[PDB]
């Protein structure tokens, strides 16, 4: 595909800009549906039966998500009648606002599409456009941080790490593990929103970079654990060392800068007399680490995936941000712990 693929990709970039730079309620409504028209062609790409099934499952869940969001916009005319994105002014519209944004994100009750959508994506270039897409509903949630009830956000954040922590244990597909770490990390996202809206934006920065480092290192084609197994000996051994720095960082480990969200999310919550919730956060986070525990053994060990066919010609992929971003993803906890102020 020539220029038209870049134009479609630029309209997702432009689509989230309408969401970011906004004041009107129908303006963000357009911004969400600008993405809906633009992700689907990249979802298809290679003319697959899996791609047709994934896109239809992606659309029918996210089209209903937007129409539930528009109901919250119309109730904002029923009561008050002000079309400025600041507060919902309703105990009813706030319910239909948070649950609609939960549909677009990987939050607890509306998570079922996430693993099956990720499987149907043809290439690693399309796999980024779900992790980057989650910036759009998060940007609205930052704007309407008050007037939203704790009983139907924090319950959806706690359950998502529970179902995320058990949702990747019986899975071997590399796309499916990344799809359930998405559900796992979204619980750490929305838990901060009541206890200071700050650090939610920084949690995005850590997550989006760390997820993009994975798929750019998955440019050497691998879909399963057994296909990423034949990489230690048949392919380059230095590549297994750099993926190890990204696998272990996604779980809660302090020498790596993937502990930098788990630094402040617990810290800000403990300030507001809540200890029983951050305990439940950190223990369930070990189940998220446990996926990468068995996935590190694919790279650290021999595991016998030799294969008679040996590659002599050197691999030439895109690798656009595959060098600059993992250096920041591995070490930033010693570099910038004062970056909380710089981001938000």
């Amino acid at each position: 595909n020539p220029i038209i693929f870049i134009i479609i990709l630029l309209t997702i970039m432009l689509g989230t800009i309408i969401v970011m730079i906004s004041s009107h309620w129908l303006l963000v409504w357009i911004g969400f549906e600008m993405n809906m028209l633009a992700i689907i062609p990249i979802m298809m790409k290679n003319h697959n039966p899996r791609a047709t099934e994934a896109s239809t499952k992606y659309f029918l869940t996210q089209s209903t998500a937007s129409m539930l969001l528009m109901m919250a916009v119309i109730i904002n005319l029923m009561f008050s009648g002000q079309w400025t994105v600041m507060k919902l002014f309703n105990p009813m519209a706030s319910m239909l606002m948070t649950m609609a944004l939960a549909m677009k994100l990987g939050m607890a009750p509306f998570h079922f599409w996430v693993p099956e959508v990720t499987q149907g994506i043809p290439l690693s270039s399309g796999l980024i456009l779900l992790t980057w897409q989650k910036l759009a509903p998060m940007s609205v949630l930052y704007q309407i941080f008050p007037s939203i009830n704790l009983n139907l956000i924090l319950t959806l954040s706690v359950l998502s790490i529970l179902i995320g922590g058990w949702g990747g244990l019986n899975q071997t597909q590399l796309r499916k593990i990344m799809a359930y770490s998405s559900i796992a990390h979204m619980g750490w996202m929305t838990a901060v929103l009541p206890y200071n809206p700050t650090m939610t934006l920084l949690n995005l920065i850590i997550y989006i970079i760390m997820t993009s480092t994975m798929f750019t290192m998955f440019m050497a084609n691998s879909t399963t654990t057994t296909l990423s197994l034949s990489h230690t000996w048949n392919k380059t051994p230095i590549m297994t060392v750099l993926i190890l720095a990204t696998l272990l960082s996604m779980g809660g480990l302090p020498p790596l800068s993937g502990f930098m969200p788990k630094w402040m999310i617990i810290q800000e919550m403990t300030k507001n007399n809540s200890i029983i919730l951050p305990t439940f956060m950190a223990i369930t986070a070990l189940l998220n680490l446990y996926f990468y525990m068995r996935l590190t053994y694919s790279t650290t060990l021999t595991m016998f995936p030799s294969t008679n066919n040996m590659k002599m010609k050197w691999q030439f992929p895109l690798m656009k941000k595959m060098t600059f971003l993992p250096t920041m993803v591995v070490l930033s906890t010693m570099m910038l712990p004062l970056t909380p102020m710089l981001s938000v």
């Binding site: 590549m239 750099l242 060098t323 250096t327 930033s332 910038l336 102020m341 710089l342």
Partner: protein, 113 residues
């Protein structure tokens, strides 16, 4: 905490450019090491001989992390000062909220063993 009398467009405020910037700081050097580290593993993923002795596009990798890191630290020096300034001004204006207690030699229980 949150933003009050501050607006977007151009990251530093320029109106509050009074505090001195970071000059040859140890924080700048560590990001400079990361800029060098990004110029080491690029020859590891894309197969190039010797991470230390290879192609000299590493000068771009050092400068970029220093350049972005300098303005990032300038944002850090600004925002920490404003957060402190609004904290000090809140105590000076209200006074009744922050209470002072001085001079006490109160009795406390002594533990055995």
């Amino acid at each position: 905490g949150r933003q009050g009398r501050a607006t977007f467009q151009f990251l530093p405020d320029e109106a509050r450019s009074l505090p001195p910037p970071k000059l040859t700081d140890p924080r700048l050097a560590f990001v400079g090491f990361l800029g060098y580290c990004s110029g080491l593993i690029d020859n590891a993923i894309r197969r190039r001989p010797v991470l230390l002795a290879g192609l000299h596009r590493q000068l771009l990798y050092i400068t970029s992390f220093v350049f972005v890191g300098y303005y990032l630290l300038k944002r850090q020096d600004y925002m920490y000062a404003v957060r402190d300034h609004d904290m000090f001004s809140y105590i000076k204006s209200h006074x009744x909220x922050x209470x002072x207690x001085x001079x006490x030699x109160x009795x406390x229980x002594x533990x055995x063993x």
